[PDB]
Each structure stands twice: as C-alpha cells, then as structure tokens.
C-alpha cells in the first residue's frame with residue numbers, strides 16, 4: 001500500500017461520497033482505468049466546491065495553478081498549493097494519458113462565472129453551461145474510456161456529459177431554487193408560463209410539468225444518440241457507460257413518480273442500480 005495508493009483511495013472516497021451512481025458504475029472498470037476516473041472526478045469536484053472554502057476565488061486559483069504546473073512540467077516534483085493528494089494522482093494520470101487540459105480550464109472558467117450568475121436568456125446559453133460544467137469533464141475522460149480517440153469519441157463523451165448535467169438539473173430543481181439558482185432558460189420559462197418561485201410555493205401544475213418534460217425529452221434523445229454510438233468507447237467501458245447512462249435515465253422516472261416534487265431529492269435505489277446492470281450485462 002504505497003503513498004500513491006493512498007492518494008487514489010482518497011479520490012475514490014470523494015467520488016463515493018458525492019455521487020453514488022457514478023461511483024457504482026465506474027468502479028466496475030479495470031483497476032488502472034477506475035483509478036484514473038477517481039482522480040479526474042475528485043479534481044472536478046474540488047473545482048466545483050472551491051468557492052465555498054473561504055467564500056472567494058483564492059482556493060480556485062491555487063487549483064488552476066496546480067493543473068498548469070502539471071501541464072507545463074508533467075515529470076517534475078511540485079509542491080501543490082491546493083489539495084496535494086488529488087494533484088499527485090492527477091499528475092500520475094497525466095504521465096500515462098493525454099489529458100485535455102483546456103477542458104479543465106473551461107470548467108474552471110464556468111465556476112468563476114457562476115459567482116455572478118445570471119439566469120440564461122435562452123436554451124443555447126443553458127446548453128453552453130452544460131458544456132462548461134459537464135461536457136468538459138466528458139472530454140477529460142475520453143482518453144481513459146477509449147483506446148484510440150478520434151473527434152467522434154470526444155463528441156459522444158461530451159454529449160453524454162451534457163445530458164447527465166441536464167438530468168441533474170431536472171432532479172434538483174427545488175434544491176437549486178433554494179440556492180438561488182434556476183437553470184431553465186428565461187425564453188422557455190416565459191413560453192410555458194412557469195414561475196419557479198410560484199411552483200416552489202404552490203406545487204406543480206400542468207405548465208410546469210410540460211416545461212419539465214420538454215427538457216426531459218431533450219436529455220432522452222441525447223442519451224439514445226449516445227447509446228447508438230457506444231462503440232467509440234473501449235469494450236470494457238461500454239457496459240459501464242451504458243450503465244451510468246441507464247441509471248440517469250431512471251432518475252427521470254424517479255422524478256415523475258415523485259410527482260416532480262420540488263421539495264426533496266429523488267434517487268435510484270442501490271438495489272435498482274444492480275438490476276439495471278444485470279439487464280445490460282446479460283446483453284454483453
């Protein structure tokens with residue numbers, strides 16, 4: 001059990017803690033691929049959580065500088081300014097894999113922006129945000145999940161990232177509203193005559209359900225497009241990625257069964273995840 005094992009085990013802990021579903025699927029990858037996934041995940045999570053450490057951009061700028069050190073000198077010893085365990089594991093991954101560093105920088109830029117968040121005028125802006133926060137992370141994962149990356153591999157991974165984000169949005173409407181965030185676009189809220197504050201106070205209605213289902217149908221079509229292009233990924237990652245997906249599709253059903261409540265977080269029971277993987281894996 002080396003120092004490097006401990007760094008990876010820490011990254012695992014972070015991923016298990018903050019996303020049971022992704023944890024459940026990507027943990028099924030062969031050992032060197034899953035460890036690379038944990039490290040990427042943990043870095044992205046730290047970026048996502050950085051503003052609330054002191055309440056400003058300090059820690060986020062140290063994370064960015066750590067990443068830039070790795071990118072510029074992948075083989076030098078660095079005294080990392082942010083979370084050393086995570087940055088050592090990332091550096092280890094970078095020595096073995098072609099990481100898209102600009103995709104971490106895009107992610108970090110989306111975080112800086114989110115300090116002065118203003119609602120999206122249009123869906124194009126919402127989708128731009130899903131790229132920023134999640135398509136970027138798909139791009140970063142691409143060399144880990146495929147043998148030979150082409151632009152298609154990046155395109156599928158990116159679309160998978162964004163459609164997972166859209167599903168998070170649709171699950172978390174109420175919690176996000178409490179945190180003063182609404183991610184549905186002003187254009188689409190206006191068109192469907194929906195006011196989130198009003199829906200949070202008074203319950204769902206038919207306009208809200210129609211708005212929600214509008215975006216659910218986008219996520220679902222994107223998901224089918226990903227599944228039809230599953231073979232861009234390595235054979236070992238294909239059932240894993242198919243499973244990660246299927247579980248997020250199921251989140252949409254969990255929301256509908258809970259009548260679109262804006263007052264709790266719904267989830268796919270662990271035993272249900274094991275059932276989806278049985279279903280998938282029978283066909284692998």
Ligand SMILES: O=C(O)CC1(CC(=O)N2CCN(C(c3ccccc3)c3ccccc3)CC2)CCCC1
Pocket residue numbers: 018019020021022026037040041044134137138139141157160161162164165168
């Ligand atoms: O709970 C929450 O608030 C949100 C959760 C985390 C989450 O949904 N995302 C969406 C993007 N995935 C990417 C990813 C990064 C690293 C490893 C696996 C997956 C990804 C991007 C692209 C392709 C696949 C996967 C990471 C962050 C935690 C609870 C479950 C949903």
Ligand SMILES: [Mg+2]
Pocket residue numbers: 168169172176
């Ligand atoms: Mg959200």
